[PDB]
Write a protein that binds this ligand. Structure first.
Ligand SMILES: *[C@@H]1O[C@H](CO)[C@@H](O)[C@H](O)[C@H]1NC(C)=O
Ligand code: NA
Lengths: 276, 99, 7
């Protein structure tokens, strides 16, 4: 039961009418707790998890100011980046960054992250040591030199060991029922005759939390890695997740196939067959 | 570095004809973030479509969930129609009760 | 809710 507070930030230099110049969504593990954005310089904030109703008004008023200041700073940085990469005005460009901290069961800090991308590609990453940076090119190497000359990671560590920990601790307490849980998958195999006369076996997993899961089909003396159709894990919209993996198999050979489900809420993997 | 959306249409709960449910359209793996998403019942746009906030994954691509209330039957068809700047034309994905 | 100037 390790836990993370994560924020996913996006700044857009020339967004469409009505679209955000700046947006960030905050999560604890796989549960979203808020939306912040700035549209035409107007900041807005919305709660997204029930425990956020326990926050004092001062939380939202400090947050509003953070949104305004972050949105302007990100816009300024998009302007500088356009210049250093000698790109054209009039085009829209994207600056993204992820901020997180992670604690263990005893609430001990285990790690933290700060990483940024420009136009969908890695730009700069803070290393595991929380003191040095990794760049990808000569523009981001300038950034690294600035941040290291300035000691800027000191102020990021002060954020990690200050407000990131504060909020992670408070949210895990106020949202304990939602957050300190693992819901195991409920799984079954569905059976679908095909026109050609063979069969689809679709192994389903529903109702699980958190999202991380593995579904695997195995025959017996055969590996089915390249035969499986696997959908990307997907939200049910009620806080749980679902997934399936399918294989096409000969009619009358269904009992040779086994679906295995691995999830942190299970004590041992489920092994499932088409029961019939 | 544009990335094309992947689209999945599915129900929140296993479908049973005549029983209220929620229809999901989950759109992932796209960049840049501007996206247009509609849902349609028997060829008619559904106005009451809710959108989650957009977020993004480890590889920086965006994702978003569109959802609406629905009661599946034997004779109604549902679609999700998506347009992104990586696409010359919109793509429609229909709901399949088996997927 | 933190931001570093990259340039
Ligand atoms: C931008 O243009 C200058 C002018 O020639 C050049 O020195 C610099 O390398 C360019 N930046 C990139 C990222 O190519
Ligand atoms: Na549970």
């Amino acid at each position: 039961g390790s836990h993370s507070l994560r924020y996913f930030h996006t700044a857009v230099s020339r967004p469409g009418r009505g679209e955000p110049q700046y947006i960030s969504v905050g999560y604890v593990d796989d549960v979203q707790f808020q939306r912040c954005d700035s549209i035409e310089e107007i900041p807005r904030m919305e709660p997204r998890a029930p425990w956020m109703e326990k926050e004092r008004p001062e939380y939202w008023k400090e947050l509003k100011l953070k949104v305004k200041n972050i949105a302007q700073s990100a816009r300024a940085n998009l302007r500088t980046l356009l210049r250093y990469y000698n790109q054209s005005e009039g085009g829209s460009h994207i600056l993204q960054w992820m901020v997180s901290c992670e604690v263990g069961p005893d609430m001990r800090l285990l790690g933290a992250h700060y990483q940024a991308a420009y136009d969908g590609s890695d730009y700069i990453t803070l290393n595991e040591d929380l003191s040095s940076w990794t760049a990808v090119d000569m523009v981001s190497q300038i950034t690294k030199s600035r941040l290291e000359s300035a000691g800027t990671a000191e102020y990021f560590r002060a954020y990690v060991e200050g407000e990131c920990l504060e909020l992670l601790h408070r949210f895990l307490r106020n949202g304990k029922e939602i957050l300190q849980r693992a819901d195991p998958p409920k799984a079954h195999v569905a059976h679908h005759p095909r026109p050609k006369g063979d069969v689809t076996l679709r192994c389903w997993a529903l109702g699980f939390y958190p999202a991380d899961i593995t579904l695997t089909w195995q025959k017996d003396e055969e590996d089915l890695t390249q035969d499986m159709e696997l959908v990307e894990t997907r939200p049910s919209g009620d806080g749980t997740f679902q997934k399936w993996a399918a294989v096409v198999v000969p009619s009358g050979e269904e009992q040779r196939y086994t679906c295995y489900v691995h999830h942190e809420g299970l004590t041992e993997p489920l092994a499932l067959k088409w029961r019939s | 570095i544009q990335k094309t959306p992947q689209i999945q249409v599915y129900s929140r709960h296993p479908p049973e004809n005549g029983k209220p449910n929620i229809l999901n359209c989950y759109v992932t793996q796209f960049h840049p973030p501007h996206i247009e998403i509609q849902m349609l019942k028997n060829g008619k746009k559904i106005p009451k479509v809710e959108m989650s906030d957009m977020s993004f994954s480890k590889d920086w691509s965006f994702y978003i969930l569109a959802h609406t209330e629905f009661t599946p039957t034997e004779t109604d068809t549902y679609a999700c129609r998506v347009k992104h700047d990586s696409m010359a034309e919109p793509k429609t994905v229909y709901w399949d009760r088996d997927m | 809710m933190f931001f570093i100037n990259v340039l």
